[PDB]
Every structure is written in C-alpha cells, then in structure tokens.
Enzyme design. Sequence first.
Site, PDB file in Angstrom:
ATOM      1  N   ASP A  38      -3.092   4.288  -0.836  1.00 46.23           N
ATOM      2  CA  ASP A  38      -3.480   2.904  -0.516  1.00 46.23           C
ATOM      3  C   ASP A  38      -4.374   2.702   0.486  1.00 46.23           C
ATOM      4  O   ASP A  38      -4.436   2.780   1.627  1.00 46.23           O
ATOM      5  CB  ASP A  38      -2.270   1.861   0.085  1.00 46.23           C
ATOM      6  CG  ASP A  38      -2.600   0.564  -0.215  1.00 46.23           C
ATOM      7  OD1 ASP A  38      -1.904  -0.520  -0.254  1.00 46.23           O
ATOM      8  OD2 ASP A  38      -3.932   0.107  -0.217  1.00 46.23           O
ATOM      9  N   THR A  59      -1.549  -3.912   8.974  1.00 48.80           N
ATOM     10  CA  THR A  59      -0.043  -4.573   8.948  1.00 48.80           C
ATOM     11  C   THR A  59       0.358  -4.627  10.392  1.00 48.80           C
ATOM     12  O   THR A  59       0.338  -3.774  11.357  1.00 48.80           O
ATOM     13  CB  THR A  59       0.814  -3.224   8.335  1.00 48.80           C
ATOM     14  OG1 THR A  59       0.152  -3.113   6.896  1.00 48.80           O
ATOM     15  CG2 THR A  59       2.249  -3.755   8.222  1.00 48.80           C
ATOM     16  N   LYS A  62       1.551   3.726   7.664  1.00 49.24           N
ATOM     17  CA  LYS A  62       2.938   3.133   7.559  1.00 49.24           C
ATOM     18  C   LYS A  62       3.643   3.822   6.713  1.00 49.24           C
ATOM     19  O   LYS A  62       3.243   4.492   5.681  1.00 49.24           O
ATOM     20  CB  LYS A  62       2.911   1.468   7.615  1.00 49.24           C
ATOM     21  CG  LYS A  62       2.486   1.324   6.110  1.00 49.24           C
ATOM     22  CD  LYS A  62       2.397  -0.257   6.063  1.00 49.24           C
ATOM     23  CE  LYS A  62       1.710  -0.781   4.616  1.00 49.24           C
ATOM     24  NZ  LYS A  62       1.569  -2.191   4.424  1.00 49.24           N
ATOM     25  N   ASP A 111      -4.377   1.675   7.472  1.00 44.99           N
ATOM     26  CA  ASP A 111      -3.164   0.982   7.145  1.00 44.99           C
ATOM     27  C   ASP A 111      -1.906   2.192   6.960  1.00 44.99           C
ATOM     28  O   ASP A 111      -1.008   2.344   6.331  1.00 44.99           O
ATOM     29  CB  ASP A 111      -3.310   0.177   5.711  1.00 44.99           C
ATOM     30  CG  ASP A 111      -2.311  -0.578   5.409  1.00 44.99           C
ATOM     31  OD1 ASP A 111      -1.900  -0.872   4.216  1.00 44.99           O
ATOM     32  OD2 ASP A 111      -1.408  -1.024   6.309  1.00 44.99           O
ATOM     33  N   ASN A 131       3.131   3.789   2.744  1.00 47.27           N
ATOM     34  CA  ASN A 131       1.937   4.225   2.139  1.00 47.27           C
ATOM     35  C   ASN A 131       1.995   5.588   1.957  1.00 47.27           C
ATOM     36  O   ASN A 131       0.949   6.231   1.804  1.00 47.27           O
ATOM     37  CB  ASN A 131       0.663   3.948   2.814  1.00 47.27           C
ATOM     38  CG  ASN A 131       0.375   2.396   2.396  1.00 47.27           C
ATOM     39  OD1 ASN A 131       1.019   1.634   1.818  1.00 47.27           O
ATOM     40  ND2 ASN A 131      -0.429   1.749   3.204  1.00 47.27           N
TER      41      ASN A 131
HETATM   42  C1  LIG Z   1       2.313  -1.200  -3.669  1.00 45.68           C
HETATM   43  C2  LIG Z   1       1.687   0.305  -3.717  1.00 45.68           C
HETATM   44  C3  LIG Z   1       2.111   1.427  -4.199  1.00 45.68           C
HETATM   45  C4  LIG Z   1       1.160   2.186  -4.268  1.00 45.68           C
HETATM   46  C5  LIG Z   1       0.806   3.454  -4.649  1.00 45.68           C
HETATM   47  O1  LIG Z   1      -0.132   4.062  -4.727  1.00 45.68           O
HETATM   48  N1  LIG Z   1       1.928   4.097  -5.149  1.00 45.68           N
HETATM   49  C6  LIG Z   1       2.143   5.376  -5.847  1.00 45.68           C
HETATM   50  C7  LIG Z   1       3.571   5.731  -6.282  1.00 45.68           C
HETATM   51  C8  LIG Z   1       3.564   7.092  -6.878  1.00 45.68           C
HETATM   52  N2  LIG Z   1       2.398   7.809  -7.254  1.00 45.68           N
HETATM   53  C9  LIG Z   1       1.366   7.139  -6.675  1.00 45.68           C
HETATM   54  C10 LIG Z   1       1.101   6.287  -6.035  1.00 45.68           C
HETATM   55  C11 LIG Z   1       0.091   1.671  -3.687  1.00 45.68           C
HETATM   56  C12 LIG Z   1      -1.564   1.777  -3.561  1.00 45.68           C
HETATM   57  O2  LIG Z   1       0.408   0.242  -3.457  1.00 45.68           O
END
Ligand SMILES: Cc1cc(C(=O)Nc2ccncc2)c(C)o1
Lengths: 13, 351
Positions: B185, B202, B169, B167, B172
């Site tokens: 992610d 995606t 992109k 995934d 992420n």
């Molecule tokens: C929609 C989404 C955001 C994230 C995500 O891990 N953010 C994130 C933001 C800041 N610090 C750590 C992690 C995932 C897995 O999906």
Amino acid sequence: AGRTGRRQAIHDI
Amino acid sequence: GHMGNAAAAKKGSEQESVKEFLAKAKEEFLKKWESPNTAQLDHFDRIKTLGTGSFGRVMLVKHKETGNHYAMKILDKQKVVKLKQIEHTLNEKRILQAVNFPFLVKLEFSFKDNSNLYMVMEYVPGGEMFSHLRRIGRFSEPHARFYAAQIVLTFEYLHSLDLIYRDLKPENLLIDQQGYIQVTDFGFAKRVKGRTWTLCGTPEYLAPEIILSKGYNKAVDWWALGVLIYEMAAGYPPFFADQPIQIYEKIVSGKVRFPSHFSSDLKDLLRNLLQVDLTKRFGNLKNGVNDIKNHKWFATTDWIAIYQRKVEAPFIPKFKGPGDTSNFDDYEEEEIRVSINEKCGKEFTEF
Ligand SMILES: Cc1cc(C(=O)Nc2ccncc2)c(C)o1
C-alpha cells in the site's frame, strides 16, 4: 477503549 | 566508551558500506523512475477479495497463461474523486515500478480500463501482521524487534531516495513464506525533497506536525515507527481512542504511557521516536538513522543479516499451496463491472 479493527487511511484530516 | 576499538572500527566500516549501497540504489532507482499497460483484465481469473479500502479492493487473481497468483488492487476511477486521490494514485504506481528492496512488495503489472485502475503485485500468502497481532495479542520484544529492524532498513532505503511512506501500520505489513515482512500500500508514498503539506495517513499513526497542519518531512515515518513498535509490543497503539478527534488530542499532548512489561531499553527508544519536538526526534538528528540503528534496544540486531534474510524468523505462516488464502480474513464480494464509456480519461492519462 479504542479502535480494535482495521483502520482506514484518511485523505484529509 | 561504549565500544572498544574493534567494535568502533567495525561500525564505521559498516557506515561507509551503507553509503556505498545507497548510492548504487539511487542510481538504479533513478533509471527506472525516469524510464518507466503491461497486461489487461481478461488475462486473470479473479478468485477472492483479500482486503478493501476507500477506492476499491484487492483480490487474489490467477494469471491465465502462467498460472501464477497475484494480488490485484482495483481502484474505481470515479471514486478516485478527491484531488489528492488522483496524484496519490500516480505516486503509488510510479514509486512501486521504480523501487527494489527485499521488504517491499513487487509490482508486476499495471493497466487501466474504462472504469478502473489496476495494480498487480506479487501475492504474499502469509497474511497481514495485523491479524496475527490481534490473534496473539502482542509480540514479545525479540519478535517485535525482528519486524522493526526490517522497517528501519526499508525506511533508510526509501528516505535515501527522497521517498516518504506515510502509512505505516500492521494492516500494511504482509508476512511472507519465510516470516519476513513485505510492505504494501504505497497510496500515500511521495517523493519529497524537503517538506510536504497533505493532511493524510491513518489517525493512530499520524505525527503531531501532520495533525497541526504544519509542513512536514520524512520524520513523520520515524514517529510512525514508534507507534508501530509500541503496538507490536503492547497489542494496542499508544494514542488509543474510539474517535479520530480524541486520538488527535492525545497525539499532540506529548504524553505517552507504557505497559509495565516494556523493558527500559524499549521505553527509551520509544520516547525518542514518539518525540513531538522535531529537534529531538530520532531519525531527524545529525546522525540520522544511526541514532535508531545504534540504540541499545537494537544491540542484538545484525542489520546485514536481516537484510540478507539470514536470521531465523520468529513465526512462519502455514501455507497449503499456491493460491491458499487461509491466512486472510473474508470480505464481501462484488462483481467487477466495466462501463462501456471511458470515465475520467483526461485525469488519468499518465497512469
Ligand atoms: C486493503 C489492501 C490490501 C492490500 C495488499 O496489497 N494486499 C496484499 C495481500 C497479499 N499479497 C499482496 C498484497 C492493499 C494495497 O490494500
């Protein structure tokens, strides 16, 4: 023209 | 040849050192993979939603006891309804608890309750590459190359462990306080010794073999790297259309057009990553990742210095203090409701 916002994953094409 | 004696011997020694590193990395991974409820919900104050996805949301949380901030991914068990949804969520937890690399987000806790699964990661406050890229338009080639190098090393690491990421992109890729990347992610990551068959990813980033319902391997990640580098350097991805079906038709066609400002070195790299023919795609040949690392576009890249984080980043996000969310977009907030009855207990016994 194409997708400019966040793009979601697909679990099945 | 291209290299003189000094350079060629330096490169060979470098290759042996990579083998040595990856052998130790595999030993460490396997110990965690074979020998893996480290908290509960009421241990955290929930602050703000940082992002959303199919099964739920990621929130900034503050651990009550220590005051440390974390990103908590909340997955609604019932919404993890799809068969491939369940297995994928187990893959994500198990892989994240076993990997260790400087450009991979660190999982700190995981737990479940009657309604939800939770994965609690280090908070990376600099925001997603996605919003910085959309705001500035496009990154210059040196800037794109700095990020791409980190992805190349991360995939070299993951693939050596027989892990595919699936995934890639900008959404992420988080930017840390030093301007380096953290990949997040792992919802589609999987241990695959040869081929796998799930239709997932995606649209804009899918390799043709995924779209064509062919069993596929880690080369899909190298295709995706080509899409990412193109999008970083152009501001838009190479297969660009309003609807997924139109995107899929462009991907399979085997045609890519480049902006007039792309260097010839960049176009050459991209033609070899965005290669439909798997017998010709860089990353998938006898020399493996070295066809990418030794490409002319990466000639100025000091791979070890990137890994050791010795290279000055092109962009350092602004940070106002712990728990600052200024580099993230806003999302609709919804209260976390935990049912009095356990949902889907048998399906998630292993989580
Ligand atoms: C929609 C989404 C955001 C994230 C995500 O891990 N953010 C994130 C933001 C800041 N610090 C750590 C992690 C995932 C897995 O999906």
